[PDB]
Amino acid sequence: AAPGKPTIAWGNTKFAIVEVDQAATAYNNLVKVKNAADVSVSWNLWNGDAGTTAKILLNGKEAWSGPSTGSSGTANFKVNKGGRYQMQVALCNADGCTASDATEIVVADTDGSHLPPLKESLLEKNKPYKQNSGKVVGSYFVEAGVYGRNFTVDKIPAQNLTHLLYGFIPICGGNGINDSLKEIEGSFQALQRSCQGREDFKISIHDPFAALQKAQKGVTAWDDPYKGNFGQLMALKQAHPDLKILPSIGGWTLSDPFFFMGDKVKRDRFVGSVKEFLQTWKFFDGVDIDWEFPGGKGANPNLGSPQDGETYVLLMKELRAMLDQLSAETGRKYELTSAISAGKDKIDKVAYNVAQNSMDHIFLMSYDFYGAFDLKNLGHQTALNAPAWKPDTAYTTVNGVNALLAQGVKPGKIVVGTAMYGRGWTGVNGYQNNIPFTGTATGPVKGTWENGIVDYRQIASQFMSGEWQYTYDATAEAPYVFKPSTGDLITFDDARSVQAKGKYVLDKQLGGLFSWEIDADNGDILNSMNASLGNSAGV
């Protein structure tokens, strides 16, 4: 007769192909990629013959076999594919096999194959849209927003996006390489911690805790391998296979390292670390480059050279070559994008008409045209067109788009930007014809998290009543609120200005729309982005 039925012994059932040290602070100690997970299973048999051969089955498929020499036993074997498996121990002899009841074992991999879909309900004013317009609908999620801003991956209205970019992957480097970071309390030190023992110019994760260790919805178990933002993004990909999730390298405070890449040795190292990063974190679909300005004029006043333009094009070409190489190894398709200044002065420092051949999308930062960083020359921070009181306005969305088109950039590459925040001044005075923008400010308006900047959510919630004047400039296609008594002036994007941008995109056959940091929207902005571009509603 066949062998008795074995019982699976108590023991850990959670394994990982890519192991993460939930206690590590240094990126070099944080993750280790393996070609497969080392799984172990033990069993006992109290009634019946132990058979002559023991086998481990995963979903009915043999994954191990060996001599069944005793009433109890242990099997060690490898699993090279992530997922949740129904595991069984089978004892066999001439008369047949007898399998134990199934025990679930989890083999984690960074593509999220071991995680159930993260399909959360829409929050606040967000309404469901189908991505059927064929246009890009993107937004940026910030890594550091999970603390005080309390905005986690589960709060992202993911179904309403085609592209989701991640709030800045930094580039390792200390004094003289990331000085711009020193302006943020403890930020430079945090990077040095992440980059402990890591070569300069290789990428890393600025906050390993927030990215992989902090408990979040869906990845809360004390022993889950991947938690934090990355763990949730993996589950998000399971829920939205077609959503493009891209890591964004750079930003205003992390762009300093880019100015040294004219040196191919450093550029090669950077590119090489990006490939390794992508091989390690499978849920990402490519890479976004946010070099805050080839030519300088970014956060660091001591950086910038006429050579940056060429470096940028070379970088994009090499990243593309690296990604093609990656495609040949994994068979997957990867995207290469870049967020760029919308000012003509900076746009002409780069040959985008050339770089565009290596890129999938160009995210035009058509915002920050004006702000508290300038108290004398005020204006619409993210308008589509110039205002009536100053038709010669240089910084507008249209001028940015025209500058690129003039270089020869194909329209379908250009994704227009919308702001989910407003910039503002205080003590505005000396203006004429009741146009606050004609005067000067005495300082920045009180912000939500920093001076001169307010979340759109707060604007709609607090500055749409009381003493606040509201005006929608139909010429520039830009709204603004003004509080006469204190001289508080705020320029931002609203449902209507976003609609104008969307229509503009459709008319000029541009690529789509994207917004800066999803955490600041109450839903009005993203709803309008989708609607204006023609995406259907429904559920």
Ligand SMILES: CC(=O)N[C@H]1[C@H](O[C@H]2[C@@H](O)[C@@H](NC(C)=O)[C@H](O[C@H]3[C@H](O)[C@H]4N=C(N(C)C)O[C@H]4[C@@H]3CO)O[C@@H]2CO)O[C@H](CO)[C@@H](O)[C@H]1O
């Ligand atoms: C990494 C870091 O230093 N974080 C800081 C944080 O700085 C932020 C804010 O100043 C962002 N501003 C707004 C209006 O949200 C700022 O955003 C920039 C961004 O860098 C540019 N790059 C893009 N892309 C499309 C990729 O868009 C723009 C936006 C709009 O100007 O980014 C910096 C970091 O570069 O500031 C907080 C305090 O507010 C600080 O705690 C820390 O988290």
